[PDB]
Design a protein around this ligand. Structure first.
Ligand code: NPK
Ligand code: NPK
Ligand code: NPK
Ligand code: NPK
Ligand code: NAG
Ligand code: NAG
Ligand code: NAG
Ligand code: NAG
Lengths: 123, 121, 123, 121
């Protein structure tokens, strides 16, 4: 089997793109995310992400997580999922995400977390 | 003025340390979990994340990833740092726990979800 | 060990309340929910809920699911959890929920779902 | 005009039928899943839920619970029925799969999360 590697430029059906740089010996990587959609009402900007891939037993399809530090919103998104060789032999990232909104009041914390999936292929 | 830096615990008795948050909002930390979904022995594990600095909010949101050192799994946490008028701090978060599955046909069952509330330890 | 039963009036820390009726032999139940808070700009009203308790292997601490059909918004929330006898011998419902907002456009689907917990105790 | 009533399938080839939706928005249905997290043999299982009828929207939200007949688990699904200019419908949902745990101490790991997209026939 190929190893599924995170390093590279990725896209989803929507056409958001993200670029992940080299993954270091501690499993750390950095990258940038450019979303095609927003919950905000200002200009979208390219935002950094930082995360780690899990290296336990050196799996060829490893899990990973990362945090996107949005540069245009007070929110944060975290993604986690796994790098798979898909049925067609291509790498695919199968992820899920939580988008945390900023709320003014701790009484509103209950409504601040949205959840979804995101599936990425190489661009 | 709600800062992520410090030692934190939850009601379960898991603890977390977080270091200085740099001017880009990056921090690293450790997480020692009281419980695992695994049969392995727990080991303190590193975390890395960022705090959101847009508009220098006093109660910022943030995310981090815990890179478990006794499992093939990864957990992410996101939430917000609340600070009351005593200056008591609370991090209210939700997490996704991603297990490693051997086949892509099992991906659907690989992601668990929950909350974790942390106070200063 | 008591059987943990869904039937009864329940509250959470926030003071939202819920009443669940008799659970039938097919494990169905009906009730009502009054939420203390809301994410819409709308006026809050008591709303019905309908769900089932799982009765496989007649467990004393069953899982269950229910849908709240909000009467004051176009939203729906589903809750699922388990009815435990807690360490102190009280019943407790430990649940998680998904709150589905109505969006006007399919392209907004990605952001229509919030997630949370709710812990109920008998009122 | 987006109606829930019908037989539905997803990319995995799970199927679901939903019957008539009454004037209170209630419906019942069945779910035959292609996959399971369990080691039991899958059996068709009943589902019950409601469609939201406030402002009688063309693309209403709805929820339902699947009462699995081969597991101690329960799944809830919630989402929205979308209908294109052509009359082609799709149900975009997310779900929580609650496992049964023996002790309240394991509750934190009992809830899995996912999506499911259904189409007609
Ligand atoms: C599930 C969804 O996820 C994404 O691809 N998403 C993106 O690429 N961007 C949004 C991001 C929001 C950045 C926000 C900052 C803020 O608003 O605070 S986080 C997940 C979502 C998606 C949305 C779509 C879509 C296809 C997909 N998808 O392919 O997964 O088509 C129209 O909208
Ligand atoms: C919801 C729960 O969350 C946690 O605190 N959790 C932990 O501190 N540990 C587990 C972690 C699992 C490490 C695993 C690596 C692997 O297994 O693959 S991730 C979230 C959960 C929790 C449980 C409790 C509690 C308070 C909280 N809480 O505040 O988060 O009191 C009684 O039990
Ligand atoms: C986690 C949270 O959950 C609830 O209690 N929730 C409620 O009782 N109400 C909201 C409901 C919203 C109905 C919305 C219709 C619409 O807006 O579209 S859905 C579950 C959530 C909660 C919020 C709190 C709190 C304690 C808890 N809790 O104990 O879980 O203290 C002050 O705010
Ligand atoms: C995300 C996933 O979800 C499903 O379709 N699912 C199913 O139809 N079956 C599993 C169910 C198992 C219930 C369990 C009883 C028990 O084990 O306790 S609940 C949701 C999931 C899915 C998987 C796929 C797919 C498309 C989708 N989808 O559209 O959601 O194509 C390849 O595999
Ligand atoms: C993603 O990359 C493609 C090709 O580089 C480009 O045409 C598209 O606009 C990019 N998406 C965004 C949101 O920038
Ligand atoms: C958390 O720290 C406390 C006291 O400092 C300690 O007794 C407890 O063992 C720690 N929890 C874990 C899982 O290490
Ligand atoms: C919960 O019920 C108690 C009545 O016992 C009531 O005082 C409280 O306000 C109720 N909550 C709501 C939202 O009605
Ligand atoms: C779904 O329906 C199709 C035929 O209509 C059938 O071939 C398929 O096996 C069904 N799926 C399951 C899981 O029963």
């Amino acid at each position: 089997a190929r190893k599924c590697s995170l390093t590279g430029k990725w896209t989803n059906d929507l056409g958001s793109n993200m670029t992940i740089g080299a993954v270091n010996s501690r499993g750390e990587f950095t990258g940038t995310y450019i979303t095609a959609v927003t919950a905000t009402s200002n200009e979208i900007k390219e935002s950094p992400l930082h995360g780690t891939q899990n290296t336990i037993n050196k799996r060829t399809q490893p899990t990973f997580g990362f945090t996107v530090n949005w540069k245009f919103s007070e929110s944060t998104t975290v993604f986690t999922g796994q790098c798979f060789i898909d049925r067609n032999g291509k790498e695919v990232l199968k992820t899920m995400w939580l988008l945390r909104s900023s709320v003014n009041d701790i009484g509103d914390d209950w409504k601040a977390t949205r959840v979804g999936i995101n599936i990425f292929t190489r661009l």
